Amino acid sequence: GRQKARGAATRARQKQRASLETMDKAVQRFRLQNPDLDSEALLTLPLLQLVQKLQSGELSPEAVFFTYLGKAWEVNKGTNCVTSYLTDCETQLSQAPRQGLLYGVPVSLKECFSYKGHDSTLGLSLNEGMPSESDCVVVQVLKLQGAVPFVHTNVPQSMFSYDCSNPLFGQTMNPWKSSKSPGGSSGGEGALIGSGGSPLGLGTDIGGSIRFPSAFCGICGLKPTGNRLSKSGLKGCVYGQTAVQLSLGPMARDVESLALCLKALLCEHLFTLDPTVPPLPFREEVYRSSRPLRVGYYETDNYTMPSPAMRRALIETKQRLEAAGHTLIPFLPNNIPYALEVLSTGGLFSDGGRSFLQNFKGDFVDPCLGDLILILRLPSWFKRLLSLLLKPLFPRLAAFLNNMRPRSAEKLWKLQHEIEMYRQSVIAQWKAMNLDVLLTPMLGPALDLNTPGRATGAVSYTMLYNCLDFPAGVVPVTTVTAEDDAQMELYKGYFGDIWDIILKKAMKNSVGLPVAVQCVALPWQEELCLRFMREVEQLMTPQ
Amino acid sequence: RQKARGAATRARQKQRASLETMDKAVQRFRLQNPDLDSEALLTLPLLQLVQKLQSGELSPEAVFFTYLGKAWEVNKGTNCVTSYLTDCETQLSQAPRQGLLYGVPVSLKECFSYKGHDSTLGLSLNEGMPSESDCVVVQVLKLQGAVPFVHTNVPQSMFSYDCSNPLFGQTMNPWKSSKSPGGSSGGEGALIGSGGSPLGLGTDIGGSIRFPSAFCGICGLKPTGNRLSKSGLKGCVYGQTAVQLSLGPMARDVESLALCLKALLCEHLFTLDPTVPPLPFREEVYRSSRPLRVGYYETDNYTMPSPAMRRALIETKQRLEAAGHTLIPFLPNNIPYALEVLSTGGLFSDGGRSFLQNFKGDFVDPCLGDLILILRLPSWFKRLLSLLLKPLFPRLAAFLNNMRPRSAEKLWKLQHEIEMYRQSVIAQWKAMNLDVLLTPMLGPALDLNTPGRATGAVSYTMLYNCLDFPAGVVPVTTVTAEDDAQMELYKGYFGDIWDIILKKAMKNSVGLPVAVQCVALPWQEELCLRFMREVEQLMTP
Ligand SMILES: *C(=O)N1CCC(Cc2cnc3ccccc3c2)CC1
Ligand SMILES: *C(=O)N1CCC(Cc2cnc3ccccc3c2)CC1
Ligand SMILES: [Cl-]
């Protein structure tokens, strides 16, 4: 009794296949006409250079476009990141505003960015055969800014997992090792950009979903403050949940590409299409700024034990920043357990998961969601009871469960006030130390396919800054050595509960995979956060 | 009811002593300066006062104590001052010289935290619980050279557009003592409107900057809710975010509002409250004189306007036309739904239960009307009573049914609807390619104790709290005898008890001010101010 859903999957798949076929024919024809094109120089040019060469006219858009389109199709063979080819981009290609700061640049789009005439399924059956009526606001500016959006990239079912699988388009895989997860929910983007198949893309992040796949796939991402960019026309599962803001941001191969993307997005076209975004232009002076920083740091959040590879990544970065003349100050946000267990969990699931669970009636539940659906479906009394039984043995589990229960509007107000207060608390702690910026460990290396869904507590490094609504970004700094991988077999975890035990295992067999560091600033300080990410990049990956 | 009588007695002796201190102070100053022209000092516009302070032509002591004295006098008739911020003479000598508000005395609505003073809000439970530091906004006024000098009265719990409470009593309209000064920023309306402060700060969640400014014949702006910092404000409910609180300036002219905003939107604010987007005052947008595409309406088809409101609005329209702006009819869609389901649901999602906590044990002031008795009613009876009402009095039924406690699930739905509704109007706006929107503003002032029984009148202002657009108010005319006689033909659109109370309440108002409202898209407060300036210039030069 799941026939509408199997119907959905057959259509989704036949669509994907057709998309991928159109791409192939498009690129096959281009190559026939352009057999002397230096395809290697083109693909591996950094975005700034690619952009100037489009601007200068040294490269035509078609050159850069059809080259990339090709590489996209090829990496998809190994990764399954492309759900659909945005088929009207050859019209936008020739119509692409020449004065635009992204003139010529092919951009990949997470599947939840509305695009005229395409599904934003999110892997749910019920969003299939329901094409978006028009581009979303962000796509409209990208397009006005010269860019060429050309693919929708896979997401986990409902977007509420940091793996990347669904019953429609199936499962995306890490380009460095197909046994691993690309992370999620922006996994499609991570895998594509990560294997050279796109020079810039866009994802969303409400608990780490830009930073997770960026880190896992060896690329960069920024989650700006939630209302820096416009969420008009973005597809989601719940609407009207404002305790924890959704934030949307760029994913690229280097920091400078994130900066350009922000400057291009942060312009009059955006502010006029979405009046509700504050018209805060991109302060380049602050981005370009190069003075010594007061950098707070922690090696561990005392919640998720870092992997050896993570802590190496973090100490080595710290030590380089000191080398470079920045002041490194021990710092740890107060009451992280509260922040994750009561504030974030409570705001994400204030209604017990009822609104979210609706999306799943009649549909399959993808393996990479774990028991999330099972646990949300549990009645409130029983969630509470199970929570009390769990509490003495596994307190972390008890905490989360009990905060995933439905509440009254009265209790929501109280929660949202607490979130306001926690945010001020941390800002005060931050100013007490007079920090400029905050260096943090980032989850890594990639967990095995279908394991993120069972290691929820490892969302601690990223979700904190969704709760606080601070800008936060992720840059790659190192890769897992044999020594690191070995030390993992002694990994214990702070709680010793099912989530730590799975994580030990999910990070096994990781030698070679990219591991990241995290960069946070105060609200609306994206350009400082990005300035700081650039320093880390310059130091830790000089080339 | 002992605690409530005790708190009243305490409140009253605290207020009395402040006035004494004030008196003593001004009286010592005047002996030392018998030949200062206080008539000239007090009637200079803020911009010229400020320049004179900056040149040195005037001492900060001269302007401080001269305004302090006027405040004491005007308080005798209005009862607008609840407390003298007694430590402001230290601040006087400390005010940084480069500050854009150097030497300006500023009045504060009672709810802006001030180190060492209560923010009672008229509630007994808040009495004798002094604030322990200054709110961010008060800190930046000080870092900008201003001198906050008094807390001014509010209605009990701030949830009324009258201005009385069992603690400090009842504030009056300085134009006519039988009239309300409006509220909840009523104290500031009375004080500013009678010459006792050149600039004040108030807050607005459903009209509370705009009502008293209109009723008392001064200017005010309710910005986009998050343009300024609400870190440190005293309130009754916290973490209601569907309809945003907004704080903002009140003053005698539009330029005062503009300067004040230029003073607040600076690095001190953005550093003290990082949660506020650091948008500086775009001086070029405010100073611009390009012709404007002015959306307008004469009535929200919900609250029938007073003859004075109508004339005010049409006279303004006509002058803007004369000055070559394009005037385009425009009415946000679904106002009735916006007020009845979105705005009321947003403010009372929890049945008013959090609100009600604040009244446990206190008297309920008469100017709240029956808000409290209504909310104390159990949901099932609110729904039953709403059903009875619906056929003859839908507005009433509509509000009552929407003041019932809901789930978090239901609040998400309501929250999502507010978001969609905000975008639907932005879409209307852009379809007619408007810059700015001209609407009526409630007026003239209602009689004492009638606003709390005329909740329907909230429609003109609250629409834009719901939508979170910047809205400001400018006095444009005064009620004529022709205007006032005509109120005798006013009927209302619904004929319900709100329309009957309102009719009566707006009567006997010859000579009272009547405003017009200016609106702009979110984050467009400088354009909105540019529009307010133009309306001031044309209607009251
Ligand atoms: C991206 O922004 N995501 C996807 C990953 C998800 C992680 C997560 C999964 N399950 C729970 C259950 C309860 C509380 C918090 C979380 C987080 C965060 C959003
Ligand atoms: C200032 O922002 N205020 C003071 C006046 C108050 C008016 C008001 C009173 N009662 C109800 C009941 C239901 C819905 C709306 C209102 C508004 C608005 C806020
Ligand atoms: Cl905002």
From Swiss-Prot, chain A:
Residues 1-371, 402-543 are cytoplasmic. Residues 372-401 dip into the membrane without crossing it. The modification Phosphoserine is found at residue 209. InterPro entries: Amidase_CS (IPR020556), Amidase_dom (IPR023631), AS_sf (IPR036928), Endocannabinoid_amidase (IPR052096). Found in neuronal cells throughout the CNS. Expressed in liver and brain, and to a lesser extent in spleen, lung, kidney and testes. It is a single-pass membrane protein. Substrate binds at residues 159, 185, 206-209. The keyword Repressor does not apply. One of its GO terms (molecular function) is lipid binding. One of its GO terms (biological process) is positive regulation of vasoconstriction. Its EC number is 3.5.1.99, 3.1.1.-. Optimum pH is 9.5. Disulfide bonds: none annotated. Signal peptide: none annotated. Homodimer. Belongs to the amidase family. Catalyzes the hydrolysis of endogenous amidated lipids like the sleep-inducing lipid oleamide ((9Z)-octadecenamide), the endocannabinoid anandamide (N-(5Z,8Z,11Z,14Z-eicosatetraenoyl)-ethanolamine), as well as other fatty amides, to their corresponding fatty acids, thereby regulating the signaling functions of these molecules. Hydrolyzes polyunsaturated substrate anandamide preferentially as compared to monounsaturated substrates. It can also catalyze the hydrolysis of the endocannabinoid 2-arachidonoylglycerol (2-(5Z,8Z,11Z,14Z-eicosatetraenoyl)-glycerol). This is Fatty-acid amide hydrolase 1. It comes from Rattus norvegicus. The gene is Faah.
